[PDB]
Amino acid sequence: DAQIIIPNGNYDVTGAGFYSPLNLEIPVGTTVTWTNDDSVPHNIQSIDVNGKVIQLFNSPPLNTGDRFEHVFEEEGVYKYYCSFHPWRVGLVTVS
Amino acid sequence: DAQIIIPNGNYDVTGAGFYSPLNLEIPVGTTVTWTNDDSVPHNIQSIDVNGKVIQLFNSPPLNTGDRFEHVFEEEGVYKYYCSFHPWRVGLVTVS
Amino acid sequence: DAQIIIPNGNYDVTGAGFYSPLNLEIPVGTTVTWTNDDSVPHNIQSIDVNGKVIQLFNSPPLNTGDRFEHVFEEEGVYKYYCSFHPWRVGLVTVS
Amino acid sequence: DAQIIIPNGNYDVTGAGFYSPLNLEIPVGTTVTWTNDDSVPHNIQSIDVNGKVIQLFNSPPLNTGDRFEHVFEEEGVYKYYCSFHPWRVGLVTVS
Ligand SMILES: [Cu+2]
Numbered sequence: 001d002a003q004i005i006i007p008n009g010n011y012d013v014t015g016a017g018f019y020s021p022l023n024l025e026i027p028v029g030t031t032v033t034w035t036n037d038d039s040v041p042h043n044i045q046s047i048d049v050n051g052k053v054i055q056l057f058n059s060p061p062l063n064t065g066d067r068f069e070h071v072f073e074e075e076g077v078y079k080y081y082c083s084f085h086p087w088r089v090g091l092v093t094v095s
Numbered sequence: 096d097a098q099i100i101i102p103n104g105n106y107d108v109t110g111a112g113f114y115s116p117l118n119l120e121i122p123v124g125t126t127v128t129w130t131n132d133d134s135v136p137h138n139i140q141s142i143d144v145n146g147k148v149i150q151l152f153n154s155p156p157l158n159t160g161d162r163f164e165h166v167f168e169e170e171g172v173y174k175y176y177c178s179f180h181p182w183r184v185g186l187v188t189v190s
Numbered sequence: 191d192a193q194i195i196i197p198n199g200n201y202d203v204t205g206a207g208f209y210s211p212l213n214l215e216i217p218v219g220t221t222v223t224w225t226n227d228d229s230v231p232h233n234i235q236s237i238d239v240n241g242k243v244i245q246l247f248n249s250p251p252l253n254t255g256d257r258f259e260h261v262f263e264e265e266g267v268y269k270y271y272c273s274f275h276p277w278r279v280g281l282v283t284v285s
Numbered sequence: 286d287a288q289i290i291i292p293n294g295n296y297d298v299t300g301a302g303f304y305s306p307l308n309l310e311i312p313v314g315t316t317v318t319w320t321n322d323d324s325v326p327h328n329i330q331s332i333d334v335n336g337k338v339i340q341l342f343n344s345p346p347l348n349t350g351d352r353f354e355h356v357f358e359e360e361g362v363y364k365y366y367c368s369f370h371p372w373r374v375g376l377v378t379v380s
């Protein structure tokens with residue numbers, strides 16, 4: 001019940017089209033659900049503070065309409081990107 | 096006091112090289128300073144939740160070493176990007 | 191007989207979705223046929239090392255389902271791209 | 286010999302800046318060397334015929350001036366990209 005949408009145009013290098021919301025603010029214990037609403041595949045990969053991929057939450061490929069969930073059980077700031085479009089970086093802030 | 100750095104390599108079309116911190120968390124009334132530490136010009140433009148440019152804070156072009164400041168007097172979430180590199184989007188979260 | 195397909199998703203700014211095959215190997219004198227199977231317009235332009243368009247084989251805009259043909263009568267390695275999606279660069283290798 | 290250059294500007298989504306040569310033709314048993322001549326980090330990851338990353342030859346990050354090598358012992362066509370810039374796709378063709 002806390003959603004992040006990957007919107008139409010997320011595949012492009014435009015200002016518009018970033019993950020929605022770009023920083024999801026949630027309390028500990030929340031399930032986060034990403035949905036791909038774009039016209040191309042995407043995925044969700046946790047990255048470290050400097051933007052290097054790490055193994056905290058890592059989705060399979062998501063076709064249009066596919067979903068990925070992760071439960072955030074610890075306070076902190078979590079960045080993520082998409083391995084197909086690494087410049088698309090979002091955050092989940094758990095407090 | 097509440098600094099954001101545009102790092103060397105922010106011009107890169109990839110994840111690493113994003114604004115540091117990507118979400119700056121500050122209390123209301125704080126003066127925020129962006130510094131361009133990159134090797135090319137950048138700017139800072141406030142955008143809304145859909146990525147449309149708005150006139151809340153808008154910098155001139157910043158050369159290497161240049162700084163831009165904005166005082167955030169109100170509570171809220173403020174997205175911004177660079178019109179030269181629109182894929183580079185960050186936030187200031189004011190509480 | 192010697193075909194290159196522009197697949198659905200070629201407009202994507204990423205690896206997957208590239209021309210199929212990305213390097214077409216053909217004997218000299220062969221007629222090569224490109225087909226646009228994607229859902230947006232594309233074109234086929236021969237380019238130089240600097241990604242500037244050169245005059246050798248240069249298609250009109252290709253609508254979905256449209257085809258473009260060129261007869262390759264000289265041996266050599268021929269780069270081409272799409273001016274709408276210049277990151278999509280392929281080869282025809284004639285021997 | 287068997288060198289591929291990652292040129293200046295390869296980080297961008299432009300026509301210019303593709304791997305040089307885009308297709309490297311070599312005989313079996315050849316050591317191939319990639320060199321990063323760009324102003325940002327790159328890496329080299331083998332991908333399958335459709336452009337999905339696979340474990341076959343996979344470099345660490347390459348800073349400016351760094352090299353990566355792989356010995357190609359088997360005939361075939363081997364695509365690769367960069368995990369930082371997935372749209373930059375090249376080939377090694379082994380005969
Ligand atoms: Cu993506």
Ligand SMILES: [Cu+2]
Nearest residue numbers: 057069070071
């Ligand atoms: Cu999980």
Ligand SMILES: [Cu+2]
Nearest residue numbers: 137177179180
């Ligand atoms: Cu910029």
Ligand SMILES: [Cu+2]
Nearest residue numbers: 232272274275
């Ligand atoms: Cu195109």
Ligand SMILES: [Cu+2]
Nearest residue numbers: 327367369370
């Ligand atoms: Cu790269």
